[PDB]
Design a protein around this ligand. Sequence first.
Ligand SMILES: *[C@@H]1O[C@H](CO)[C@@H](O[C@@H]2O[C@H](CO)[C@@H](O)[C@H](O)[C@H]2NC(C)=O)[C@H](O)[C@H]1NC(C)=O
Ligand SMILES: O=c1ccn([C@@H]2O[C@H](COP(=O)(O)OP(=O)(O)O)[C@@H](O)[C@H]2O)c(=O)[nH]1
Ligand SMILES: O=c1ccn([C@@H]2O[C@H](COP(=O)(O)OP(=O)(O)O)[C@@H](O)[C@H]2O)c(=O)[nH]1
Ligand SMILES: *[C@@H]1O[C@H](CO)[C@@H](O)[C@H](O)[C@H]1NC(C)=O
Ligand SMILES: *[C@@H]1O[C@H](CO)[C@@H](O)[C@H](O)[C@H]1NC(C)=O
Ligand SMILES: *[C@@H]1O[C@H](CO)[C@@H](O)[C@H](O)[C@H]1NC(C)=O
Ligand SMILES: *[C@@H]1O[C@H](CO)[C@@H](O)[C@H](O)[C@H]1NC(C)=O
Ligand SMILES: *[C@@H]1O[C@H](CO)[C@@H](O)[C@H](O)[C@H]1NC(C)=O
Ligand SMILES: *[C@H]1O[C@H](CO)[C@@H](O)[C@H](O)[C@@H]1O
Lengths: 12, 524, 515
Amino acid sequence: QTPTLGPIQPTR
Amino acid sequence: RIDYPKALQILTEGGTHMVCTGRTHTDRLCRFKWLCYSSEAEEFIFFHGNASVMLPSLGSRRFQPALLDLSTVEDHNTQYFNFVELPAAALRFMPKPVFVPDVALIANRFNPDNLMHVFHDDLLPLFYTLRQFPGLAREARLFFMEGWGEGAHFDLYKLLSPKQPLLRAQLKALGRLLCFSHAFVGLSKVTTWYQYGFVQPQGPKANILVSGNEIRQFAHFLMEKLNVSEEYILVFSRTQNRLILNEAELLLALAQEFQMKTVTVSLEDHAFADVVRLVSNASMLVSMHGAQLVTALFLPRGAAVVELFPYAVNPDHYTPYKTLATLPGMDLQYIAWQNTMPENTVTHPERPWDQGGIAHLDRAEQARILQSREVPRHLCCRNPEWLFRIYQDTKVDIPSLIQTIRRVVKGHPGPRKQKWTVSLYPGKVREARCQASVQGASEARLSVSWQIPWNLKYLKVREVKYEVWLQEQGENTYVPYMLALQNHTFTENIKPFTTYLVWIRCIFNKTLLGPFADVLVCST
Amino acid sequence: DYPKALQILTEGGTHMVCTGRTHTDRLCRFKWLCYSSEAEEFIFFHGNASVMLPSLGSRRFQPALLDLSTVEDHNTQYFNFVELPAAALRFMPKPVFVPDVALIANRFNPDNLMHVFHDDLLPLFYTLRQFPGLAREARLFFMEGWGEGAHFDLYKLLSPKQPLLRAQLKALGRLLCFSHAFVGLSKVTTWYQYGFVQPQGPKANILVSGNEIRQFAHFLMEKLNVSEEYILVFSRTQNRLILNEAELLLALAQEFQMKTVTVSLEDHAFADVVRLVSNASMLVSMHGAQLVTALFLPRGAAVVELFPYAVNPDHYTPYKTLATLPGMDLQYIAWQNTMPENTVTHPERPWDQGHLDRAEQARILQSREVPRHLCCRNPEWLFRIYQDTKVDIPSLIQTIRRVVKGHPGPRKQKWTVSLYPGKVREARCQASSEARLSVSWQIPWNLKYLKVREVKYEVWLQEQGENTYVPYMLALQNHTFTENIKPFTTYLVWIRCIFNKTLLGPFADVLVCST
Ligand SMILES: *[C@@H]1O[C@H](CO)[C@@H](O[C@@H]2O[C@H](CO)[C@@H](O)[C@H](O)[C@H]2NC(C)=O)[C@H](O)[C@H]1NC(C)=O
Ligand SMILES: O=c1ccn([C@@H]2O[C@H](COP(=O)(O)OP(=O)(O)O)[C@@H](O)[C@H]2O)c(=O)[nH]1
Ligand SMILES: O=c1ccn([C@@H]2O[C@H](COP(=O)(O)OP(=O)(O)O)[C@@H](O)[C@H]2O)c(=O)[nH]1
Ligand SMILES: *[C@@H]1O[C@H](CO)[C@@H](O)[C@H](O)[C@H]1NC(C)=O
Ligand SMILES: *[C@@H]1O[C@H](CO)[C@@H](O)[C@H](O)[C@H]1NC(C)=O
Ligand SMILES: *[C@@H]1O[C@H](CO)[C@@H](O)[C@H](O)[C@H]1NC(C)=O
Ligand SMILES: *[C@@H]1O[C@H](CO)[C@@H](O)[C@H](O)[C@H]1NC(C)=O
Ligand SMILES: *[C@@H]1O[C@H](CO)[C@@H](O)[C@H](O)[C@H]1NC(C)=O
Ligand SMILES: *[C@H]1O[C@H](CO)[C@@H](O)[C@H](O)[C@@H]1O
C-alpha cells in the first residue's frame, strides 16, 4: 500500500 | 569498542555534530555524531553542547518543510526527517543512553512490499549511498525508520549489508534513549528514474542521472550475493491477479513465431535467486505491467522487454519499465502491447477498493467508469478507474501481439553476438587561434584553426566533426557551422574593424557533443 | 603494491559517486581518477568496474561536472575530466599512484585574506568533516594554478599532511592516478557573493550561523597556540589609509575609557594578530580584507567599519553580513565619510589600483555615490574604494554611540542558544443547534525538559477544500471555535508551538474534524 500524502497546508 | 563513561562525557559536554550536503531538503545527505533518539517519543534528538555544529543552520526554515527527505520519493510529506533539540545538559534528567555500537545509515523504505518500489526506491539508492562515504558499505548497519515490518523482500535488503538491518520497532527494545556516535541519514536520488504521480501524473523523472551501466554494476553485485553466475523466451506470470488468461496459448505461439524455447516464471513460486537466474539468461521477457517487471534490470544486454497492458490502460501513461529498458547504456529493446478488445478483458467490480473494485462508488461513477475506454490522467494513489482497469485479467490477442513485437525485433530476439562499446565524449579543442584580412569597407575574412582534443590523441573515432559558433561581440545572435577540418575561413557578413567571439566544440559520431573551449576573441 | 594497483586501474577503471542534483552543489568521491601533467586534464578511464554517478551524457558540459571553488558557477573555476578507455593506458607512461586520500579544490584568491577565509578555509574545514577519515588523513591538492600566496601558513593548519600545488603534481610524473580522491567544496559556510551577475551583497539563503564560524575559529586558534580591556584598530599601511591615526586612537581611548591598540598584518605574526583580536572589545578598521578577522572577536564585541567618500556602506557588506549573522553576537556600526575635504583621490595610480576619457573621468569626480555595478574591474568603484580618508572624529564617535550606549564589549552579557519546539502531541478535536469545534493538545516532548519564558500555540482553522485558513494565537493548550463554524462541514486544524514569539516549531499531523 503506497504511502499517500497527508493534507497540504493552505498556500493562501 | 566503547568506553561508556568517556562516550557519555563527550556527548554531555560537546553535544551533537551535524554536517549535510545540499541547499534543499530534497537534495540532502547528513553526517551526524552523537545523534540520539528517544524510542518512547520516536523522535531523533540534537543535543546542543559546546562542540555542536549544525550545517545547514536553518532556524525556523528547518520546518519548511523539514531537514531532508528520508525516502527517495521527492518531497513526500509523510517521509520527512527531522529532530527535536535539547541542551546537552538535559541528559541529567533522562535515562542513561544506550550507545549504538555500529555506524548507522538511517533511511525510510518507501513501499517495501512492492518489488519495484524495493529495487527503485531503496536497494539501488542504498547500494550507492553506502558507496558515497568511505567505510560505510563494510561497516554500516541499516536502520529502516518508516515503521513497516520486514515485508515480503527483507532478504533482499539483507544482501546490501554484512550486518542485519534493524527496524524502528526493534529500537525500543534496545533502550529508552539511544545515541549513535556516528550516523548517516538520507538516501541519494541519483539512481531514480520514475516518479509516482504525487504532484503531476506519474512518469519518467525529469532529469535522469543514472545510466544502464550503474544499474548493471548493482545487478552484478546482487547476482554474486545470490550465488547466480538453449536460448529461451521468459514469460513472467502472476498467479493472484492481473492474469494472462491464455498463458498456454501464448507460450506455444511465442515458441513457434520465434523458434525458441518458451518458459514461465513467477515470484510466488520460485526462490528469488532462481528468478534472477532465469531472467539473467533470457533473450526476451514477456509480462503484464507490474512489479515483477523490475527484474528486467537483470536481463542481458540486447534482450527484449515485452510489456502487456490491460484494456483502457494507455502504455504511454505508465512507463516505469519502458523508462528502465530504454535508459542509455541499458541496451534493452522495449515493446508495449495494449488490449484494445473489450471482449478479451475480465472486470472485477466487486473486489475491495485495494484490488480495483468499484462497488463502493456511486452508481453514477460506476457507470462512467464502465463506459470509459481509457483511464483518464490521474494523481497517486487510489484513483478508482485506474485500479479498476489495472486489475483486469487479459486474454491476449496473440496475432496482434506478434505483429507488435515484430515491428521492433526484426528476427532473432536477444543478444546475438553483439559487442557493446561505451560512448565517451571529446575533450576541448586546444590552441584555438585566428587571424583576419580586409578587402574593403564591407568585406573581410576571418581564419580560425585549432588542435584536436587531447583525448582524441588516444582514440580512434569513426566520425570527428567540429561545430563553430560565430558571434559579433555586440550581438545576441550567433551562427553555428559544422566542419570536418580543423580550420576554416569565414567570409559571409564578416566586417573590418569588428570583434567576433568564436566558440568551437568537437563532436564524435554526430551525437556525442564535447565541451566548448574558452572563447576565442578575434578582431578584424 | 604497485602491480595490484595498476591491475585494478587497468581492468576496472575510474569509479565516481557524487552528491547533489546540480553542478553548483556537487561533491564527488573518485577511485582511480587520473591526471595528465602535460595536458593538465583529469582523466576518467572506462573499465569493467567503472561507475559514473551522475551519468550526465553531454550535459556534463552544461556547464561542467562541479564548481571547484566555492564561488558559484564561476566559468573559470569548473572541474571536469576527459574520458578514455582504460586500455588506452598502453599508449601512456606507467602511472604514478598518489597513495594519500586527496581532497581536490581551487583556491579563489589566495592573496586576499577575506577570500582565503570565506572561499577556502571555512569550506575546506567543513568539507573535510563531511566525509569520514578525511579530516585526519587527507592531503589537499590546490589545482587553481596560483602559487603558495601570502597565507599558505593558514592552509597548512587545515591538514597534517602538507598541501600540494598543481605545479608540484607535474613534477611527480607525466601520468598521476589517485587511488582515492574527493573533489569539490561545500558552499554551506559562505555568506557573500562578489557580484558577477548582480551587484555584490549577502548570499540569498545563508546556511551558516555564528556558532559554526566560531567552532572553526576555535580550531584555528588552538592550532595557532592562542587561548586590560582594549579597543583594537586594524591599520592598513600600503593603501586605503586612515590619515588621522594618532588622533583616532586618543579620541577612542578618552571617550570609551579604555586602552587602544594598533594592529597590522604586515608587522605581526598572524598568531599574534588573532591573539589581539580574540580578546578585543571593539575592532575599528577601514573596509578591507583584514576585517575578516572579526570572526575571532569575542561575543558582544563591536565592529566599526569605516568607508571612504562616495562608498555607500549598504552596497559593500561582507563584514556587516558576518558581524550580524545569527549567533555571531557582534554589534555592527558602519561609518561613511560625507565630507570631500577628508577624501584623497589618487587618479594617477595604475588601473590596478584605479587612463580613460576626460569625459568619463569628469563624471567620476562629479558623482556623490558609486553606482551599483558588476564585478570586477569597475574604475568608478576602484577609484573611490582606494582613496585615503581623514576620519571626522565627532561624526564617527556619534554614530558609534547610537549603537554602543556605555561601554562596549562582552560586559555582563550572557547568550543562550535558541532551540525550537517539537510538535505538539496527542492533538484531539470534538465537534458539536449552534455548530462548535473544540481542540486540545499536549506539550511538545522536548518542552518536558525545558524552561521557556513564553510558550504560545499558533492554530490554523481551515475549511476543507479552501486554500486559506483563519489563524489564532493561544496561550492555552485547548480552544473552542465559535466565530466561523458552520454545520456539516469538515475542518482542518493545524497547530504549532512557538517559543518566545520568534521560535516557530513544526506543525503536528493535521486534525480533521467534521460538524
Ligand atoms: C545464456 O548463457 C549461455 C551460456 O551457456 C550463453 O551462451 C554462451 O555465449 C558465449 C558468448 O558470450 C559463448 O562464448 C559461449 O560459447 C556460449 N555457450 C554455449 C552456447 O554453451 C548465452 O549467450 C546466454 N544467453 C543470453 C541471452 O544471455
Ligand atoms: O499475482 C500477483 C500480484 C502481485 N504480486 C506481487 O505483490 C506486490 C504488490 O502487487 P501490486 O499489484 O500491488 O503492485 P504492482 O505489481 O501493480 O506494481 C508486488 O511485488 C507484486 O509483484 C505477485 O507476486 N503476484
Ligand atoms: O595596506 C595593505 C593593503 C592590503 N593588504 C592586504 O593585501 C591583500 C590585497 O588587498 P586588496 O585591497 O586587494 O583587498 P581588499 O582590502 O579590497 O579586500 C588583502 O589580503 C589585504 O588585507 C595589506 O596587507 N596591507
Ligand atoms: C569544550 O569543552 C571541552 C572540555 O570541557 C574543552 O576541552 C573544549 O576546549 C571546549 N570548547 C570546544 C570548542 O570544544
Ligand atoms: C586544417 O586542418 C587539417 C586537419 O583537419 C590539416 O590537415 C591542415 O593542415 C590544416 N590547414 C591549415 C591551413 O591549418
Ligand atoms: C571485471 O574484471 C575482474 C577481473 O577480470 C572480474 O573479477 C570481475 O568479475 C569483472 N566484472 C566486474 C563487474 O567487476
Ligand atoms: C581579556 O579582556 C578582558 C576585558 O575585555 C579582560 O578583563 C581580561 O583580563 C583580558 N585577558 C587577557 C589575557 O588579555
Ligand atoms: C487546557 O489547557 C490547559 C493548559 O494550557 C490545561 O491546564 C487545562 O487542563 C486544559 N483543559 C482541558 C479541559 O483539557
Ligand atoms: C501505490 O501507488 C504507487 C504509485 O502508483 C504504486 O506503484 C503501488 O503499486 C500502489 O498502487
